[PDB]
Design a protein around this ligand. Sequence first.
Ligand code: C8E
Ligand code: CA
Ligand code: CA
Length: 391
Amino acid sequence: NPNQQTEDEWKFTLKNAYINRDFDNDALKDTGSWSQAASLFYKSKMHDTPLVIADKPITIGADASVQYAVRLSSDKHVADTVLPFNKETQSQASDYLKYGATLKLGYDKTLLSVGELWLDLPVTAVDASRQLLTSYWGTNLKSQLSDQLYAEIGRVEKVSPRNEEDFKKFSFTANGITKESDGLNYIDLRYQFTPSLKGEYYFGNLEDLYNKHYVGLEHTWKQPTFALTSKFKYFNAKDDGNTFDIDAENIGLLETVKVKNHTFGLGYQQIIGESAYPLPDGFLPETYFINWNATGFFKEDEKSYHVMYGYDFKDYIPGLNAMVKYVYGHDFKAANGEKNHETESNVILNYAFQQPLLKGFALQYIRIDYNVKHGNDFGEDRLFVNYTKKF
Ligand SMILES: CCCCCCCCOCCOCCOCCOCCO
Ligand SMILES: [Ca+2]
Ligand SMILES: [Ca+2]
């Protein structure tokens, strides 16, 4: 619950990150970097003030963060989407620094936060896919209004993307023209219908860009020998006032089964309307899609078919797991108006080291292969050496 932290929590991390996107076509330029980062995250316990109102204290705390990465590879003079890029000089940054702080005020099962926010929502999610992590600046209010109903409202004025140093306004870009928003006003509601069924409704008013509705329902069927996870997801995006002609729905179904150490998933997604499904500038991923991945399958009219196989190797090699995903998308058009289709495969290998000497170290390798009938084919490698210590 939201006003419930009794102890300070610190997190120290290290990340050595190699990302390489290689276009099949020789005419295009390969992107990426090699970087080393160090970071520290602090979250205070909630402290009892001397004001008690109906047997509950008013509470105060604070949070703060700092993240720092150095580029190690040589300058490719093209954007990678990992580290900042100076577009004028055409230079990848040689290093970048993020920091933030947050004021907290709590009462009973409510927590008001002002400053840096780590959001885990539609539009504003966790983005840990590259080097440093996206955060947000604004005010929000969270409450466990009952055993079954959780609510949260907020106004988010600024975003600091994963590859940038500063907090800036949200924006949307089309046809090489950029417009900014004064803010995102949102509500998110999470209802536990039964032990096996829950739902989420979200509404986001991204001022002067677009308004977004999301309904998510998730059911978990537990059996003696397997567990089946069913998800239905509905998104609706429409422009706020005018400027863009955003007109899109994204409907999705995912079914995932865990048996002993195996995982198998199938999904389907469809985009409907007169536009592609929109994402804000600055690579903000939509993590509540059934399968957020490298390319997204969110193009206008696009239907996609998703398959997933996973093995957790704890019985042969502890700390090792692997996951393979394959998506095919069709019924969208290229820019020339020609019928298009595309595929994306992912391979994800995780190894957490088990020797006590090496506690908190892990390795991760990610392989992406994208292909498209009209467009640019590529292969991407991502290799991470991670260290995490929690105290
Ligand atoms: C196959 C395409 C269907 C599209 C229709 C959308 C609705 C899907 O909602 C899934 C909800 O399933 C929950 C079933 O209720 C069981 C309640 O819990 C059982 C024991 O507590
Ligand atoms: Ca190449
Ligand atoms: Ca191609």
